[PDB]
Design a protein around this ligand. Structure first.
Ligand SMILES: Cc1ncc(COP(=O)(O)O)c(C/N=C2/CONC2=O)c1O
Ligand SMILES: Cc1ncc(COP(=O)(O)O)c(C/N=C2/CONC2=O)c1O
Lengths: 283, 283
């Protein structure tokens, strides 16, 4: 495991210790930007075309022009894995509103490519379900992967104080959406998989799990989820790039099962790992 | 007018060209931070204690500890005006979530003090009212001056395309709040001044104008404002640090008067200038 030595800023490889932005950048002053994050295994960013299509769609929703095409960004990503001499990594793309003249009006974005060790916790797939709280909130521009995590970060103290390790956002306290950094699923007692269809981020992991579940012949409903449906479900889980599929054992005082991982959630962990293995066989 | 040469980062004076943050800062990655902005005239930041009390209240709502007390921050601000050899300036404080280990969990904040020329447009007080559009939106954590301006910035294209130069947020399209960077007032045909009391930023300029209006013996109602009240008002105006009091001539196709500045709005421009003159007489 070679230590990460380099990032890329605006197409230039830079040592990690010299990777800076001038304080006029609109990410610092105005929180204006998008990002993406994905893993690399065996030298290959996972589901890369899907992440990069999302990154370009996000940038278009903020009217931020990425300074070159998808194939050139992919070349820069691969060049950075080779420069760092790593096969196993986390990769962050950031696209800011740039060095604005007036601290508000965007200009040519700043583009950052950052690289990390593969998170040690990635796809841990604990048999013990996590404990989470509901929080009334709706993410702004939820289909765009903006850099805006204020509410999620501000809630870290309250989450920890209340005895939880994460949250789930409930729009108007009525409609189940997503966590600050994960998509959210239920499994009903008849094995129907349920997840929100609107006003959420369209996770790559969510997409792979829904596809894998539908190919295994599960019923998957993408629909509005009322809060009262937490009392009808057998299982609950999170999806994300780093979690894969993560069992939820308790939401408020609703305990799912004995709190350990449900049968469908564990099957979907194996199916997700199958999607990853299949992708790496195309690389 | 001496050119601004220095900013202050974490209590160190730094040349403008060297004022940077490492890309691990949570403002860049997660949009986590607060700020404040105020003018200086005759060598004196305006209403300074009120801005600094707001800055400390904002920081406490994000659980970000400013690394010293209000009197030490004030000393640093004054030291920077002297270092730049300016009497007339705009001043920006930023407090970020800092260089987070995991790209999410805040740590010791990064504190920035930036300085600018006095905006040339500041307190222009145009007799011609500006043209603005309504936009359905509610700011997150609206009483905190967070760095999150995504929606306001994203809307710049649409504002310009629709023939306007600003917007007004309408919560659920029912309740009048504020613009992205200004508080919003109405004046009714009986001269009652109306402004929202909830789910807005508590502007310093708003506070000075309400106080000045109440001292002049106007009726000032701080209350919920229904969208249909735009058709009942004689005048509309914006308040902010840079606008002072700014006449609004049109909101959608509602034209206020002949579109030129209303009688009460102009009186409040003079009263606001009186509050500034009175403050500078205490310095
Ligand atoms: C708001 C939100 N929803 C859902 C997801 C999951 O999308 P996926 O990773 O499956 O595409 C994330 C990404 N979560 C993280 C975790 O920290 N870095 C990220 O990018 C997210 O930030
Ligand atoms: C959301 C919002 N509401 C109201 C105001 C007005 O508050 P005041 O300046 O009267 O305290 C601002 C500040 N507006 C700007 C304009 O750009 N820089 C700022 O700080 C603001 O950002």
């Amino acid at each position: 495991g070679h230590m990460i030595k380099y990032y890329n800023i605006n197409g230039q490889q830079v040592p990690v210790e010299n990777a800076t932005l001038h304080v006029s950048d609109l990410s610092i002053l105005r929180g204006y930007g998008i990002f993406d994050y994905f893993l690399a295994r065996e030298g290959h960013p996972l589901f890369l075309d899907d992440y990069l299509n999302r990154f370009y769609r996000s940038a278009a929703e903020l009217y931020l022009e990425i300074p070159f095409d998808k194939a050139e960004l992919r070349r820069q990503i691969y060049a950075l894995l080779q420069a760092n001499e790593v096969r196993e990594a986390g990769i962050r793309l950031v696209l800011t509103g740039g060095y604005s003249p007036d601290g508000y009006t965007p200009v040519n974005p700043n583009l950052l490519i950052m690289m990390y060790d593969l998170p040690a916790s990635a796809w841990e797939f604990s048999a013990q379900g996590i404990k989470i709280i509901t929080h009334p909130f709706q993410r702004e521009l939820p289909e765009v992967k903006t850099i805006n995590y204020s509410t999620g970060i501000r809630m870290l103290k309250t989450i920890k104080e209340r005895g939880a390790t994460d949250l789930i956002y409930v729009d108007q306290g009525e409609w189940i959406r997503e966590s600050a950094r994960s998509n959210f699923f239920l499994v009903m007692p008849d094995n129907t998989i349920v997840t929100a269809d609107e006003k959420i981020l369209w996770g790559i992991t969510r997409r792979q799990v829904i596809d894998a579940a539908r190919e295994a012949g599960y019923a998957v409903e993408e629909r509005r989820i009322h809060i009262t449906e937490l009392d009808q479900a057998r299982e609950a889980f999170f999806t994300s790039t780093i979690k894969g599929v993560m069992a939820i054992g308790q939401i408020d005082d609703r305990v799912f099962g004995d709190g350990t991982i449900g049968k469908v959630t564990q099957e979907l962990q194996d199916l997700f790992v199958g999607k990853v293995k299949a992708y790496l066989e195309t690389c």
